[PDB]
């Protein structure tokens, strides 16, 4: 088949991981787990046991799509950010506990990893580990996302706590979260869904005021759906479905520039014209996003009208080659 | 947000999105279990119409209920030809994330360009509000003779703040593999023989 395998990942240690994976006969799922939690402890921006994601598979000669997306708490309510006279409170839904949704991450990486993976579960996540107990370099840029995340964050909360003592090319360790790993690597989900994990996350809910309780966690579920399929040129393209936007606004995007053709014939790339006319286009994607998008089992989300190739001609016709199209005058498309 | 990509030698391919939303999440860490968790909360429309932190909006669908997913717009994405994996990519962005997925995926089909160019390359933004703004990035930022015909075609310009996407790439050529980290960031790839 191929000459090997390969990894692009976001720092050198994720790298790292994945490839060890593969040379000891993981396979892509394999090495998916293990970089994800390498990466929950060297790239704590992003890479998480704590929130959550999307993954999209192509095992044996056919595509999948996995969704441990977060869930809202069961005490969540529409107006939960408002105050009492119908305005948003400022950071309520960005900082502090409240802000939280169910985390999805442990549980999908063991789903993925249970239908899919070559390898012994505890032993993807002793990488991880090792680099919680005896530490990673902090990047400088890391470090700065650092700075601003701790003064956005204005003393209310124990972020300070736990990544106060990062600093720019100097190795940090995170000793409780290697005993958590521990955890997920003995016990499975189970630990951060119904064990001492899952503890004291209810803890520190009850600690800062937030919602998530032990009933959220036990029934969080990741779930397989269908992945976002696209095809132009004889290439197939496999995405994310709801509860994502990025499916919809995919198939939108290359249908409608491939129906434009003729107008982006001989125009440079990143051209003023390239660009207006890219922008033309996401005009209508976003107008529909706004309008229609969610979570695809809490309403009935017209996908497949978003998606007929008659639709993305119709659509496609709005697109102004030579000016801006009026802003208020792009509605969604399916609106009578 | 952070993406990885994987491709093995079976050709079996793995493209993983995943995140905390913004950086470091809600800034609340698990006293006793050291992780920090999301603040995912802010991707649903707090209220009809009022902008999100990326700009974006919402009504009934993507309104706040319990044990609901919140709308993303991360897009973990593998390409194929014939049945085999072509080209796994993904990356970060927030509402940049399937319009820099879009403009990769144009510079390598369309463009033809070689994946570390079409990595490297340029990258902006616009998603209808605000109206007529376009959004870059300081590390590839609009200038010169395009930024003023976008300014005089009636375009806001505006440098959003962070690095537009962190794209992590891999190509896959009849059997040879390629690997592209976004130079926006600190990625690393490599290509693994057994």
Known sequence: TLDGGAVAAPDQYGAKVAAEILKKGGNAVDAAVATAFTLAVTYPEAGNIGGGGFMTLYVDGKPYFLDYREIAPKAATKTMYLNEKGEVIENLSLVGAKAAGVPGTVMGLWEAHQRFGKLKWSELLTPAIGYAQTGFKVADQQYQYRQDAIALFNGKTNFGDYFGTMKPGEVFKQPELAKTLERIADKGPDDFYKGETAKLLIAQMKQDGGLITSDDLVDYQAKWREPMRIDWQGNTLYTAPLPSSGGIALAQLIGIKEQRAADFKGVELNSAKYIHLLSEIEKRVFADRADYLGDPQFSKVPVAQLTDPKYIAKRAGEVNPDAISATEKVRPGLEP | ?194
């Open chain 2, 1 to 194: 947000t952070t993406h990885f990509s994987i491709v093995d030698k079976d050709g079996n391919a793995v493209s993983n999105t995943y995140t905390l939303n913004w950086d470091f999440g809600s800034g609340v860490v698990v006293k006793g279990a050291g992780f920090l968790l999301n603040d995912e909360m802010d991707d649903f429309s707090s209220k009809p119409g009022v902008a999100n932190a990326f700009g974006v909006v919402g009504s009934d669908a993507n309104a706040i209920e319990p044990g609901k997913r919140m709308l993303s717009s991360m897009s973990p994405s593998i390409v194929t030809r014939d049945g085999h994996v072509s080209l796994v990519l993904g990356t970060p962005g927030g509402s940049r994330i399937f319009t820099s997925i879009f403009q990769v995926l144009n510079n390598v089909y369309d463009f033809h360009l070689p994946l570390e160019k079409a990595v490297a390359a340029q990258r902006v933004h616009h998603q209808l509000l605000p109206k007529d703004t376009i959004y870059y990035d300081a590390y590839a930022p609009l200038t010169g003779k395009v930024a003023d015909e976008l300014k005089a075609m009636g375009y806001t310009l505006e440098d959003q703040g962070d690095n537009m996407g962190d794209i992590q790439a891999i190509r896959v050529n009849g059997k040879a593999l390629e690997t592209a980290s976004d130079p926006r960031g600190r990625g690393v790839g490599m290509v693994v023989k057994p």
